[PDB]
Amino acid sequence: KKRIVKTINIDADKCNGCRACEVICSAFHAMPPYSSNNPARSRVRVVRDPLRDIYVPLYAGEYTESECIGRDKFIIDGKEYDECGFCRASCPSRDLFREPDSGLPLKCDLCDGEPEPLCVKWCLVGALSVTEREVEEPDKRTEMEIGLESLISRFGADVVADTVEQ
Amino acid sequence: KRIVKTINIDADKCNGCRACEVICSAFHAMPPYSSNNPARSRVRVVRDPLRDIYVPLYAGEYTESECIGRDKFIIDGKEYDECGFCRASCPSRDLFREPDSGLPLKCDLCDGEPEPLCVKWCLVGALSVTEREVEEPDESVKRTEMEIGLESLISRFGADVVADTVEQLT
Amino acid sequence: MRYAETGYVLEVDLTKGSIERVATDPRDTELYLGGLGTNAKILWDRVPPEVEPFSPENLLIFAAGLLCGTPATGCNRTIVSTVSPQTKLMAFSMMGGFWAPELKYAGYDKIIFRGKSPELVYLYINNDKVEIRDASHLKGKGAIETAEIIKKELNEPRAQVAAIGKAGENRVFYASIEQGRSSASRGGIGAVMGDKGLKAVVVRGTKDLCVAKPEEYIGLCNEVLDYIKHREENPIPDVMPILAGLGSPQEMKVHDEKWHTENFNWGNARTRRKDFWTDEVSHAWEKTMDKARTRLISCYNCPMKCGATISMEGLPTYMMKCFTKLTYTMAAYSDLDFGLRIAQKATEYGLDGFSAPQVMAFAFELLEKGILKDSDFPGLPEGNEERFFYLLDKIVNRDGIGDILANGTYWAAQEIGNGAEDYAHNNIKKHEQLPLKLSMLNPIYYLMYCTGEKINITQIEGQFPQAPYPKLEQREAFVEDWIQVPDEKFKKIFLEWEPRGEKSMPNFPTVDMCCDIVDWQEMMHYIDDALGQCAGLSSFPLKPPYHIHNYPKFIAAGAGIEMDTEKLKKAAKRYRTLVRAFNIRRGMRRVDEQPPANHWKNRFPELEKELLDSYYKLKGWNDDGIPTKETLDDLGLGYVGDEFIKRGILSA
Amino acid sequence: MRYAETGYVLEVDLTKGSIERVATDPRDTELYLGGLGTNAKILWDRVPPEVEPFSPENLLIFAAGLLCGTPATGCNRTIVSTVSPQTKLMAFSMMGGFWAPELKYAGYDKIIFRGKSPELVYLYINNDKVEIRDASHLKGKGAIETAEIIKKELNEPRAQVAAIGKAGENRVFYASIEQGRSSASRGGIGAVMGDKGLKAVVVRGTKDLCVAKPEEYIGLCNEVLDYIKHREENPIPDVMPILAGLGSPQEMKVHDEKWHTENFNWGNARTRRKDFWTDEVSHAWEKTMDKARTRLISCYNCPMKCGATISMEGLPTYMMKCFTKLTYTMAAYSDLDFGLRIAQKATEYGLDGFSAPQVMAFAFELLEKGILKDSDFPGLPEGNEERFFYLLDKIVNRDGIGDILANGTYWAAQEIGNGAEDYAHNNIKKHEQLPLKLSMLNPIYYLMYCTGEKINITQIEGQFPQAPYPKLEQREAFVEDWIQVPDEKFKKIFLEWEPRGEKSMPNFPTVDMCCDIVDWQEMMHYIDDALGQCAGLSSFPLKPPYHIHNYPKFIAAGAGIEMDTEKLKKAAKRYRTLVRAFNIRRGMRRVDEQPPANHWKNRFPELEKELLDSYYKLKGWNDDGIPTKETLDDLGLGYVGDEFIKRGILSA
Ligand SMILES: Nc1nc2c(c(=O)[nH]1)N[C@H]1C(S)=C(SSC3=C(S)[C@@H](COP(=O)(O)O)O[C@H]4Nc5nc(N)[nH]c(=O)c5N[C@@H]34)[C@@H](COP(=O)(O)O)O[C@H]1N2
Ligand SMILES: Nc1nc2c(c(=O)[nH]1)N[C@H]1C(S)=C(S)[C@@H](COP(=O)(O)O)O[C@H]1N2
Ligand SMILES: Nc1nc2c(c(=O)[nH]1)N[C@H]1C(S)=C(S)[C@@H](COP(=O)(O)O)O[C@H]1N2
Ligand code: SF4
Ligand code: SF4
Ligand code: SF4
């Protein structure tokens, strides 16, 4: 009936760009633990342009197999952010959240099994925290049929049929 | 040497009218322009006039799973929403998903048309699209919209259940 | 299949808590289009003259225009209809923003409220799901404050909310209904809403809204957008900025306030300050405005961004547009800073920004003269600005003298006596007018003040130029591409019209010319208020993108019904006389159709009589302002004529 | 397997364009740790005394500290070593920020540059990929400007760049090397870089960096972070703010500039303004700083955020930390606004913020006295502020008088003559000092000024309090938890030390106490400059989280080599005397080890002689400042001793 979601609250305005989070996450997520570190292996990566006053901790999100048809570039409150500036994706267009050697995706698991997120523990200025709440667990098979009719109207009754055979 | 396209969003210029939501959804109706519905637009404006937040957000790529932790940003004195910048077509919210079926939406820059319609209708000129060439190889697994759609349903309802329904509809 | 309209309304009985969806009659759409038109039909045969404004049988109707929710640029207006507690006549009130389209996306054309709720409640609509919620925890909250609280409770960030403030709850006769950057402001529709125990109406919609002819409809929209571009590159030549472009009066943008502050009347529509706009004042206001204006923002699907978010130091943000910017300032003989600060309070309370400042300036004139004593104002501060804040709170609480002043200048004077009636010098049909007292009689505006059922001059003017050009070359250039005119004769009138000499006002344009001009202007407004189209892109500005020639195309391609220029003109006339008929049945006669005595300094009784006489004839009404049997039958309003004869309003 | 260090260096011959990776000797790590230590070893046996600073045989070494790239908080310093063009002695220069760790992640401990490039070039490192790129399009660009241009060309947004400005390119003797919020500032290492035709060094790294004992190393780091927290909640009691906490001098944060502006000497280290810090000045500077300070930002892996981005109106943003904020202002007798504006120009040019303002103030004194004429300054503006901007441009271009002034006060005076040497009154070993002229002789600081191989007082002080507490209770409380002391005797000294009376300076602490104190302070700095640890968390502030007791634990767990307190003390001594040995071989003697004549107003020749005499003995050097054969053999520096005997520097 009810499941928990966890939100990482990032106060980019407090960030000083020290990149310590990057250090400790790679070091922990290393094998064996702490035997090495490597910011390129961090599941948190800071978007850092000091000249633009931009300091934005980004967390590893989901894996996507293809780039977007269009990439997005924001201008917000005067600041000109980078292309795909706020994307969490492990995406073929960049090296963020992907192994620097192999290229395998990386995901944040909130340090599953530790008493505390290490990125949060090492951010002494306190720009990072995690909070939890109870939501309504997912609940629905008329949705399926409505979507299959949508696909038929767009691509053809015979196209959807001979695609399902795959 | 391929071509990548950028969508330039000047959210300082946005007035929050949602003309972009109207025209996109209109054009994507079947048949085109036969109706409109902001809830199925492939561009969706984050809008909160009291907090002066106006961010246009373009649908991106499909994810079948949610992230283990969601993110919420305070940037330059503004408190944005949980996942408030994420382009993902994601099972955690209704953005970029059909409101009756849950099917993934995806922006294709009005492929085949003269120009993107959201850009055409944004009269104050908050939106634009530019292109550039890159040496980097394109490593995308190019999948058809019908195939992403069908697989999202097969992932939700099961291969056999979807196959059988398709038989009883064709 | 129904098109553009959804074909359904919500019937809500607040006394019983019952909610019903009812299908509408497609014939009513063919006769009265929608919006205001179909509202008038509902009120006519469901609200008899014996019904009081604050009785359960009075209706409060929320309507979306026929073409709201379609891609039509700027088509987003809600039309609120009821019987006014101030004028005792019909009151329709327009509200822009985002509320009407959401209702269409929810699947409804109207919401009709009857009865009274014993407890404070609000209505929650989410597609097919409708329910009445308790709102006791919202008692006294501002109209904007209320919306934010509600959306958090319901966890619906994209819901649209229309609410009343404390003023509505206390049945202030000029209480409004507020929604973000939008307001149903005039007539006291907020008072009826509060009287029914209704705190807010919350709506979320995610259904599709269809049009009949897809390719043709989107083509007309593109045509409009192209005209809007051309128009912004080519403003009306040699005319002061606020008249040169599209949109509502662009008061939130630039322009020097020289004409406005030197022609409007300060205080209780009293003082004219000829040389007020000095260099010191101009920079002071410019500085205040640059600091307070956060962003220029638009209503749904419109690029004109007439509104502006306002942020004064230490105050919650609110939204302002048009003449609200000047009224509080001018009524109190103060500066722009004060005006912006008090209008924040007034918006949250939910008060009409036309009536409220005149009421307060009215009260202080009585205190000045001696008709009111200091005994009537216990705890009255000494500073001028502070006094207005003081009185404002007394009014919205109906506390002491506030209880009387909450009734408006007309009823307040009548209750106060001692010659207080002389100071309510700016009413028409008991409704406060725009604070403008000109010198020479304007025959065109004389007619509009007298007969306009909105009883507000800025919501009946527009299509014809307010003033003539000096040089003939300027007129020839203007009429050249004036495609919006119904007849080529309107061009020839404007060519002849001159600022001075034999071809000037009040003798020119002639009586017949003035009747044709007012008729055209009024018609475009009634079409807008049926279709839901913002007047900012239609009836209000010179050379709009929407006009009598392309409007029928929109209706036909949008709603899928037969429509041409002539059938549209007749439709507009049909429910405009129906609204007239409603007010007749509530006691309105030719006697009530007079402007304030001091409205002009140069009056002409014989000319004014011939004007009104000729206008009535053109409208098809008799000499007492009543639609004749003949013209009623011709419009398909035969049932109206029969009731007039049966009620003895017309002779058999 | 090598740990903490990568075990490799890059050998680059700019004359031939050759690039080679070479494995290092693990024995050198055991003897000289890393960073400055291993730099000294390289310079000793590869740069003989006959090598000139601007000759191809001179080396420019970029080194990362031993523990850079590990999780150790604040461990990120680059150490740049070469032979100074100003002092003709060794010059090591420290640079924080993000550059040294990136080099480690790229897989290298050092880069050694030899030879000269005929064309302007830059070096690009990306993991195993190294190449020399043309940089002719970058000629004259500022050091920050250069970094941004390069990173766009290479499409490497996360690359770290160290560059010179125009000053470096023109071999200005006090030209620096800049990297974002970091600077290798003093000694003229920027001049050597430009002389070799090297415009920038660009590095990108994505390899893993390993430590020997994982669980134990991360435990020590946690211990440090916990101490940093405790320390920020418990600053040093009863001491002025800028001395009470960790980090570099926190000039970018708050604090009243009363002590600084009333004790430092304005102009050419000349004027002392006793009552300068008025209420008017305090608010004026506060206002300028609140407006200009954009954000407080940190070096790699540090929470102390000592630096600040500075944004003056109409100027590109730059980064400032520490005393740079005061030097330009004070040298020109101006305000903070001017200082922040000119320091922007000076950072892009790449000039040392200690020497450059003193050189300019020096020049204007000569113009004042008459030693220089107006003929020497063609086009000299009349305004004071404008004159400094004028002269700054002449210097970085080596234009006219700028060509002489670009050599620094010492060499400029020597070339100018006419008694200009009298005005170069603030040099030690031809190197401009911090503008501070005190009254009473400080025995502890006397020793440091005389013998410090950095020839900069702020980079040898730290661990012992600068001033004593008045009340004894304050001293008892301080020493209570003073765990950082090598011996319990340092507590007892500070207990006895008093501001006035028999137990005050210069007679107390005694000669032997002063020698032990300076030795401890100096030792901590040399350990920091080998390990790459920022002095802001170690040698510089009172009661730091890194100290002589836990440092060996870090080395052992990080690098995987045997290390204890005694072996670490000896290691520090080993390469500190090696650096001493290098300067001896280049002609330094006891005669050069004197402070400026006017450095104190109260001098004591017999006391000063005994101080230096006792310090030399403690160091193990003879009376001429030369390490003896015996102490060299004991340190494992036998090869040093042999060369001294062969060169006749020591008697057999
Ligand atoms: N189809 C159509 N569209 C529009 C109008 C029309 O008559 N027919 N009117 C215009 C104008 S000119 C405006 S600007 S502001 C304003 C007005 S108007 C009157 C209120 O009249 P009402 O019928 O209720 O709209 O008086 C003022 N009182 C006021 N009171 C409060 N509490 N807040 C306010 O902002 C005002 N503003 C004054 C706009 C107004 O749009 P809204 O979204 O605020 O309703 O509507 C145009 N469209
Ligand atoms: N290891 C080491 N760290 C050091 C120093 C030093 O001399 N050695 N100098 C300190 C001082 S006084 C300052 S202002 C900063 C300057 O940092 P930067 O070299 O990156 O500009 O480094 C601090 N950290
Ligand atoms: N251009 C420039 N010069 C500078 C500085 C600086 O940050 N930028 N730091 C000053 C301070 S406070 C110190 S401690 C030294 C550091 O010297 P180093 O970088 O040569 O080790 O340089 C001084 N000169
Ligand atoms: S550790 Fe904290 S301040 Fe440092 S970069 Fe990460 S989130 Fe920002
Ligand atoms: S990085 Fe993210 S936003 Fe950019 S193309 Fe890839 S998935 Fe889309
Ligand atoms: S929460 Fe854990 S997994 Fe996620 S970035 Fe931080 S340390 Fe890594």
Ligand code: SF4
């Ligand atoms: S059309 Fe442009 S201005 Fe309007 S909401 Fe869309 S992006 Fe913003």
Ligand code: SF4
């Ligand atoms: S909406 Fe995006 S950011 Fe949020 S959980 Fe889904 S994939 Fe992650």
Ligand code: SF4
């Ligand atoms: S470019 Fe086309 S598909 Fe993409 S959001 Fe805009 S209108 Fe929709």
Ligand code: SF4
């Ligand atoms: S023109 Fe102005 S008032 Fe009219 S709908 Fe657009 S924003 Fe609203």
Ligand code: SF4
């Ligand atoms: S203490 Fe200051 S100078 Fe040292 S590493 Fe940290 S932020 Fe940089």
Ligand SMILES: [Mg+2]
């Ligand atoms: Mg309105």
Ligand SMILES: [Mg+2]
């Ligand atoms: Mg430095």
Ligand SMILES: [W+6]
């Ligand atoms: W208005």
Ligand SMILES: [W+6]
């Ligand atoms: W310093």
Ligand SMILES: [Zn+2]
């Ligand atoms: Zn105005």
Ligand SMILES: [Zn+2]
């Ligand atoms: Zn200071």
